[PDB]
Every structure is written in C-alpha cells, then in structure tokens.
C-alpha cells in the first residue's frame, strides 16, 4: 500500500509522503494544512504600518506605502532633511512627508531662501 501512488490527496501541488499506516503532505510555500488546503495569507498579521496597503502572494507580502514612508512594512519615516534643504545655515526639522526650516536671522522663506 504505497497509498501515495494510488492517488495523492495533497492540494496545491503538495508532495505526498507515506507514513506508517497513513501519509503526510509536504506543502509548497504559502500553503499548509493536512492536505495543503489552507492558503496562508501573510497579510493576516497586519504587517504594513502607517496606513500602508498589504498585498498577498504565497509565502510573501508586499506593502504599498503612503507618501513619506518606506521599508518592507512602511515602518521608516523618510528623513526628508537628508538633502539639507534649509539654505543659509537654517535648521531642518523632519516632518511626515515633509520638513520645516528654522531660518537663521536675516533669512526667511520655506527654505530660508529670502533675505
Ligand atoms: C530635500 O531638498 C531638495 C532640494 O535640495 C528638495 O527637493 C526636497 O523637497 C521633497 O521631497 C519630500 C517632500 O516632503 C518635500 O516637500 C519635497 O520638497 C527636500 O526633501
Ligand atoms: C503548515 O504546512 C507545513 C508545510 O507542509 C507543515 O510543515 C506544517 O506542519 C503546517 N502547519 C500547521 C500548523 O499545520
Ligand atoms: C523606500 O521607499 C523608496 C520610495 O520612496 C523606494 O525607492 C525604496 O526601495 C524603499 N526602500 C525599502 C527598503 O523599502
Ligand atoms: C505577519 O506579521 C509579521 C510581522 O510582524 C510578518 O513577519 C509576517 O510575514 C506576517 O504574516
Ligand atoms: C493601498 O495603498 C495605500 C498607500 C493607500 O493608498 C491605500 O488607500 C491603498 O488601498
Ligand atoms: Ca497568500
Ligand atoms: Ca519624514
């Protein structure tokens, strides 16, 4: 009694393996259950942060981030001050999807561009 050779009961192209008196199914990525019938949806753990959208494939997820965020789970608040936008020795303060400049004395404008 091969049991597997009489016809595999595994779904989702899982591999039937004989066990003493029975069988087990070894599933491909993204599936589980005794016969590989359960789809694992990695978005069920709500991995995408900061109002990102979660997209599912077997074995994986992808987050689509709101502006201002990056990383696999949208967990990184991008530092928009990296590019030193505040001119004339201004001080850049990072914001969500933006920055604010505190301008030295004698300068003004969103980026301290005015004198
Ligand atoms: C970094 O400095 C450059 C100019 O040197 C600006 O182009 C960038 O401003 C952009 O991307 C992030 C947005 O939040 C900003 O409003 C936008 O200007 C600045 O990040
Ligand atoms: C999920 O499927 C894998 C792959 O076959 C299996 O090793 C594991 O035991 C399953 N998990 C549960 C909780 O059934
Ligand atoms: C971060 O987001 C930018 C787009 O804003 C993208 O180019 C980059 O690949 C992302 N990095 C990671 C680690 O998700
Ligand atoms: C559930 O959320 C965790 C992160 O917290 C992630 O690692 C899994 O991929 C996801 O299904
Ligand atoms: C998935 O992407 C995110 C960034 C938001 O725009 C959501 O409204 C969308 O459903
Ligand atoms: Ca899935
Ligand atoms: Ca930011």
Numbering used by the authors: 450 to 564
Give the exact sentences the study uses for this entry.
The Notch signalling pathway is highly conserved and plays key roles in many aspects of development and homeostasis. Canonical Notch signalling involves a simple cascade, whereby ligand binding induces successive cleavages to release the Notch intracellular domain (NICD) which translocates to the nucleus and directly regulates gene expression with its binding partners (Kovall, 2008; Kovall & Blacklow, 2010; Bray, 2016; Kovall et al, 2017). Receptor binding involves the N‐terminal portion including the DSL and N‐terminal domains (Cordle et al, 2008; Luca et al, 2015, 2017).
To determine whether the Drosophila ligands adopt the same arrangement as their mammalian counterparts, we solved the structures of the N‐terminal region of Drosophila Delta and Serrate as well as the ligand‐binding region of Drosophila Notch (EGF11‐13; Fig EV1A–E). These were solved using molecular replacement of the individual domains from the human homologues to resolutions between 1.5 and 3.0 Å. The conserved domain arrangement allows us to model the Notch–ligand complex by overlay of the Drosophila structures on the earlier structures of the mammalian complexes (Luca et al, 2015, 2017) with this leading to no significant clashes between the Notch and ligand coordinates. In B, C, E, Glycosylation is shown in a stick representation as are the side chains to which the glycans are attached and disulphide bonds. Purified Delta (NE3 fragment) also exhibited robust binding to a fragment of Drosophila Notch (dNotch EGF11‐13), which contains the core ligand‐binding sites. This relies on the conventional contact sites because it is abolished by an alanine substitution in the DSL domain which replaces a key receptor‐binding residue (F204).
